[PDB]
Each structure stands twice: as structure tokens, then as C-alpha cells.
Design a protein around this ligand. Structure first.
Ligand SMILES: Cc1cc2nc3c(=O)[nH]c(=O)nc-3n(C[C@H](O)[C@H](O)[C@H](O)COP(=O)(O)OP(=O)(O)OC[C@H]3O[C@@H](n4cnc5c(N)ncnc54)[C@H](O)[C@@H]3O)c2cc1C
Ligand SMILES: Cc1cc2nc3c(=O)[nH]c(=O)nc-3n(C[C@H](O)[C@H](O)[C@H](O)COP(=O)(O)OP(=O)(O)OC[C@H]3O[C@@H](n4cnc5c(N)ncnc54)[C@H](O)[C@@H]3O)c2cc1C
Ligand SMILES: N=C(Cc1ccc(O)c(O)c1)C(=O)O
Ligand SMILES: N=C(Cc1ccc(O)c(O)c1)C(=O)O
Lengths: 340, 340
């Protein structure tokens, strides 16, 4: 059994991990390879602050709500583990700010200590009028990816830096099963009109007095397009940029100002913050995550493709549930090959 | 009128500030001076985490409840000013842990979003079965004292480094009013069997992923003697040492171990954190705060003395309340002495 995972983001490496640990003992000959065009420093998973928060309203598939819950409980059960720091995992509370009362989210009982904001809190934010507060978790892309790599390496999983042209290419060279975790770039190996880049730009800033996250929502600008501040481990993420269909992997001087202006207004203290760096990333935007099997007619036999992509702006939030599920599907293949 | 403030602690400096700006227009020859033995770098006020939190059970002086109140309100109202980073002001939420279900505090509705810990939160703290969660404030003394200083220097308030031997030494030399803000040392100038040092030892550690304060209460150890973890701006405070009567201004290898074990068990992520610094200090412990007048019979006439000391573990928490009250008592003086 030769498995090939394409993708070295969270989805790729996390899915790689679950399939190993769940099956390395039941399949004496289980060889798992990671093929990636980009690695630990240069993936979308690195631009992300890694704040756990799925969508407010239940999207396309309600099975997604579970995968978040799953990812949350998992991370949560390890917030105090001694390796938490390598994982880049930690707790953070903070604010969700609105202009009008809006229904509680589906995840209200997943996070810790959910509640509405009280008058005095809303006073610190003039432009906003209603909102939530709760404790969540942050999983920073950087450390997590690095930790996944270490686990995977001692696990025998070899890593190769290469660009795949086709599933056929890989199938053609020995793979029984291909786990497809190619993020926003999935289109290149198989057309999918429903996968678009939701371009984002963030600013990293030195402001350690900021201990809470602050997310703003606004229908005039839309999902992920109003100012947000997310204190990270070493730095604070200043963002609020979402542009469907923009493939420009390049920081924009106009986007910069937009980030800076809106976060400064939200939180005046940020005025004297030291700017540490800027990054641009593409959210694998899609109506629903493609987490399903496909059988590609390779020629003699066909090969087994598991897709896992289109995690939107919430891939760190849900990755784990997705990986458990992807492994379930891997399990189903095994039986169907009378070699479980 | 000649004013002399003894003490360059928070109490000292804030009281001089309050008095000045409230009276420099109406008292033409208002010459204020600070006399101190120790300044900004090395006072008790520097050792303080600066976490706003009165005691749980109420104080003798039901006033102290309003003073902390006005302090929180005052600070909370400046948290988003341009100069907040300079004051070392910012918001921080966190836990209070207990063994048994205990009554609510009196300041319950002063802080933002007070509430109880949910079972899932208590699950993160094995050794504790109940507690609260709320959003308080931190005013780090190091920065606060520096800000105060710069205010005062630009208002003409001259500072002198000298150790006062007696109230009369200062009276003898021309001082009309003497503002007595000498902290745990107040007795050296005038006998007070109530004023005592609650020695405290802390540890400054590098752990920027902790964005929550954690305060424990173990009755089999007493107030301030349970482990606590207070994230500051640059560094995290680790503590849990309270010793009534101990005047040893020196770190204790045995007190260190106690800090470090108590805190690692409270939060294991702390085990792989870098120890940046360590300090000792004396909480000016007194059954209640002394804040009142006293006529000094120095000869042909009296000199006025305003005492404002004995703030135990909550000087920062309360300082603004006490300083308003002292400028007030400074007023009474003015009217009686026909000079309003
Ligand atoms: C600005 C910004 C902020 C964000 N903040 C958050 C947040 O707070 N919380 C959150 O949960 N999510 C957040 N996200 C989104 C989250 O980062 C993504 O949904 C998540 O990283 C998706 O994982 P992935 O599929 O990108 O792995 P990817 O990043 O897609 O992995 C891509 C790897 O696949 C490789 N690859 C692709 N195609 C091929 C090919 N044909 N051949 C070889 N290799 C290939 C690439 O080279 C790359 O190495 C944010 C995103 C952005 C842009
Ligand atoms: C470990 C520890 C942690 C603490 N944490 C907190 C906290 O989290 N939150 C909080 O609110 N509080 C905390 N505190 C305590 C709080 O910081 C103090 O109660 C507060 O600083 C009291 O103000 P003050 O009396 O110290 O002014 P001080 O700092 O004590 O005043 C000192 C000045 O008086 C001068 N002086 C005294 N006598 C004379 C003299 N005869 N002649 C000349 N000068 C004289 C000294 O030289 C010095 O300049 C903590 C204390 C400790 C020890
Ligand atoms: N996930 C985020 C952070 C974020 C940003 C804005 C929001 O309204 C929100 O709910 C979350 C992002 O993709 O950037
Ligand atoms: N003021 C603190 C911090 C602290 C420590 C323990 C407590 O129970 C509390 O209310 C506050 C201290 O003096 O140390």
C-alpha cells in the first residue's frame, strides 16, 4: 500500500498523520509520502493567525459543525499538554462586534464561556453596538506545521518538494491512494468551478499589551472584510481583507492602509505598534469542503483519490475533524481491497 | 503654600498629581515637592504585577470599595487613549480558582463580564473545583510611575532624593502641608503597630502565549500565598508568597521553588518558559488604609499632615481613589486656613 499525500499545509500534514497512526499497525506494508510544491514557511497555513472560529450561520453542510467541534475538543484536551508550545496552541478570549443583534452562533456551546457583551464593554468600541465574548483557542500555522513535520518524520513519512501535473502522473508511478490536499490550487489537477481564492492580506505587529482578539462584522463589507486584531504568540495579526477571485500573491499598498486604518480606529493603542511584516494568502473558498472519495480510471485498474480541500477561511479551525474523516474514508478503501 | 510629598511610589506620585492639577490655578504660590529615598526603578510599586483586584470579602472602610471602584472606572475610561501604552494600561481576563463553592465578591459588578467557571473550564484545572472568570485591568507600576514622573516634571513638581528623618525636620524647613506616602516604612516616621510588611517574592518569566491571569485561593496557605500567574506586557509574573512581618529584602531560593512548583502544576506549559527576572517586595499591610489629616504641633503654629499609606496588596488597584480623597482633604485645609 503506497499512499501519496499532495500538500504540506495543515490539511495535508494533518491528514497524513491520522492515516498513519490509525493504520500503520494494520497494514504491515504502509508507505506514506508527502509531495508538496511548497513547505513550512511558504504555505497559506502560515499566513493564518489560526484563530478557532467557524462560520456564524450553518454553511452548506452541517457535518462541518461536527468537524470543528471535533477539532476544538481535541485541541482543548491538549491545551495543557507539555508540548502545547511546540504545537503553538493556547487559549485566548475576545470580542465579536456587530451593528445589530444577530442570532447566537451554532458553535456557542463549543467555545468556553460564551455570553453577550455588557454595556461597558461596548463603550470601548464606539462604532459597534452589539456583540459576543468567549474563550477560544489559537493554533499558529508556523509551529503546528513544524510539529506535524517532526511527528511525521520519526513516523517514516518521507517529504518531497515537487509540483504535480496530474493525478495520472502520480498514479502512473505506483500510488494506490492519493490524498488530495492541494488547497486553493486544486483546480490545476482537476477543474472545480466552485473553488476560488478569497485573497487576504495581514499585518504582523509588535503589541504585546493586546491580550484579547477583536473581530468585527459588517454587511457593507462582508465576511472577512472588516478590521480584525488577533494577538499571536510573538506578534499581533492585523487584518480584514477578503477579495474573491484575486490571485495576486503580493502585498498591496492600498490593502495595507485599509488594514492599518480600521485596526487603529478599532483600537487606538495600535497607533504606536511596530510593524514587523506583511503577508498575502488565498483562502480556499468553496460552498463546502470536498471531503469525499473519487475513483480515477487510471487504465488497467483505477486509483483511489481522497479529496480534502476548500476549507475556506477556517482550515486551522476544522482541519482535525477533516483528517479523522479522511482516515475513515481511507479505512473504507482498505476493506474494499480485501486487505484491511 | 508649600507642599511636600514624601514617597515616590504610586501613592506618592498620584496624590501629588491629583493635588496639583486641582489647585495650581487657585493657589498662586503653590510650590509642590516630592521627597523620596527611592524612585521609579526600585520601589514596591515596581515589583507589583499591577492587576486590579480588591479582596474578596469586604473592607473595614466601606470607602475602600468606592476607591477601587473609581480607580477601575478611571483607568477603564483611558484604556483606548493614545498614551495608554505609556501608562502601561491594558485589559486582561482570567480565572479565580477555589476548592469549594464560595460567595461572590463585592466588586463583582465593577469588573467586566463577571461569571462562574463552567465544568469544561474547571477541567483545565484539576486541583480546583470551582471559580470565576472576568475581564479586569493591568496597570504595570514600572510604566505608570514613569508616566506620573513625566507629568509631574512638566508641571514644575521638583523631586529630591533624600531620606526624611521626621515630620518636623520637613516642617522645620518651611513646609505648610506634608503628604505622607511612605508605604510599609511609614512607622519609621511615626509609630504604627497596625502597619506591617506582607513580604512577597515574584518571578518574571518569558511566556507570551499566556493571555490569561490565573489566581488560586487555598485557605491552608492564606491570602497571596497560593500560586498566581499574571501576564504582563513584556513578561509573565509568577508568584504566590505572602509573609507577615518578614523584612528580608532578598530573594529566597526556597521561595523560588515554591513559586515555580506551584505555577507549573497550575499550568504545565510554564515548565518550558525562560526565567527572565526575580524580585522581592513588601505589601504595606494594614487592617485598613490610613487616609486622614493630622495636625503637627511644631511650635508657634501647626503644620498640616495628610497620611495616605497601608495599601497592602492593592495599591495599584486603589491608588486613584485614595489620591482624589487626599486632594479633597487638601481642600478642607485651604478653606479653614482662609485661602479657598
Ligand atoms: C490572511 C488569512 C488569515 C487566515 N486566518 C485563519 C484563522 O484565523 N483561522 C483559520 O482556521 N483559518 C484561517 N485562514 C485560512 C486557513 O489558513 C486555510 O483555510 C488553511 O490553511 C487551508 O489549509 P490548506 O489546504 O491551505 O493547506 P495549503 O496551504 O493549501 O497547502 C498547500 C500545499 O499544497 C501544495 N500544492 C498545491 N497544489 C499542488 C500541486 N499540484 N503539486 C504539488 N503541490 C501542490 C502547495 O505548494 C502547498 O505547499 C486564514 C487565511 C488567510 C489567507
Ligand atoms: C509581590 C507583590 C505583588 C504585588 N502585586 C500587586 C498587584 O498585582 N496589584 C496591586 O494593585 N498591588 C500589588 N502589590 C502591592 C502594591 O503594588 C503596593 O501596595 C503599592 O505600590 C503601594 O504604594 P506604596 O505605599 O508602595 O508607595 P511605595 O512604593 O511603597 O513608596 C515608596 C517610597 O516611599 C519612600 N519613603 C518611605 N519612607 C521614607 C522616608 N522616611 N524618607 C524618604 N522617603 C521615604 C521610599 O523611599 C519610596 O520612594 C504587590 C506587591 C508585591 C510585594
Ligand atoms: N478566520 C479568519 C479570522 C476572522 C476574520 C473576520 C471574521 O469576521 C471572522 O469571523 C474570523 C480569517 O480568515 O482571516
Ligand atoms: N495583588 C496581588 C495579586 C493577587 C494574588 C492573589 C489574590 O487572591 C489576589 O486577589 C490578587 C499580589 O499582591 O500579589
Amino acid at each position: 500500500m503506497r499512499v501519496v499525500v499532495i500538500g504540506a499545509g495543515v490539511i495535508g500534514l494533518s491528514t497524513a498523520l491520522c492515516i498513519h497512526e490509525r493504520y500503520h499497525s494494520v497494514l504491515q506494508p504502509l508507505d506514506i509520502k508527502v509531495y508538496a510544491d511548497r513547505f513550512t514557511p511558504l504555505t497559506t497555513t502560515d499566513v493564518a493567525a489560526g484563530l478557532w472560529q467557524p462560520y456564524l450561520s450553518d454553511p452548506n453542510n452541517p457535518q462541518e459543525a461536527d468537524w470543528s467541534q471535533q477539532t476544538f475538543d481535541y485541541l482543548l484536551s491538549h491545551v495543557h499538554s507539555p508540548n502545547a508550545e511546540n504545537l503553538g496552541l493556547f487559549l485566548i478570549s475576545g470580542y465579536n462586534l456587530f451593528h445589530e443583534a444577530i442570532p447566537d452562533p451554532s458553535w456557542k456551546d463549543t467555545v468556553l464561556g460564551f455570553r453577550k457583551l455588557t454595556p461597558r464593554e461596548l463603550d470601548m468600541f464606539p462604532d459597534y453596538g452589539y456583540g459576543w465574548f468567549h474563550t477560544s483557542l489559537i493554533l499558529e500555522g508556523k509551529n503546528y506545521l513544524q510539529w506535524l513535520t517532526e511527528r511525521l518524520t520519526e513516523r517514516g513519512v518521507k517529504f518531497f518538494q515537487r509540483k504535480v501535473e496530474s493525478f495520472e502522473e502520480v498514479a502512473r508511478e505506483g500510488a494506490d491512494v492519493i490524498v488530495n490536499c492541494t488547497g486553493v490550487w486544486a483546480g490545476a489537477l482537476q477543474r472545480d468551478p466552485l473553488l476560488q481564492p478569497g485573497r487576504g492580506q495581514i499585518m504582523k505587529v509588535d503589541a504585546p499589551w493586546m491580550k484579547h482578539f477583536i473581530l468585527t462584522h459588517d454587511p457593507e463589507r462582508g465576511i472577512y472584510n472588516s478590521p480584525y486584531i488577533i494577538p499571536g504568540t510573538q506578534t499581533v495579526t492585523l487584518g480584514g481583507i477578503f477579495q474573491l477571485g484575486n490571485w495576486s500573491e503580493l502585498n498591496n499598498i492600498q490593502d495595507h492602509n485599509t488594514i492599518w486604518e480600521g485596526c487603529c480606529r478599532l483600537e487606538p493603542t495600535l497607533k504606536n505598534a511596530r510593524i514587523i511584516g506583511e503577508r498575502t494568502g488565498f483562502r480556499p473558498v468553496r460552498p463546502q469542503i470536498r471531503l469525499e472519495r473519487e475513483q480515477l480510471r487510471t487504465g488497467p485498474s483505477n486509483t483511489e483519490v481522497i479529496h480534502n480541500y476548500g476549507h475556506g477561511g477556517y482550515g486551522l479551525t476544522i482541519h482535525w475533524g477533516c483528517a479523522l474523516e479522511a482516515a475513515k474514508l481511507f479505512g473504507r478503501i482498505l476493506e474494499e481491497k480485501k486487505l484491511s
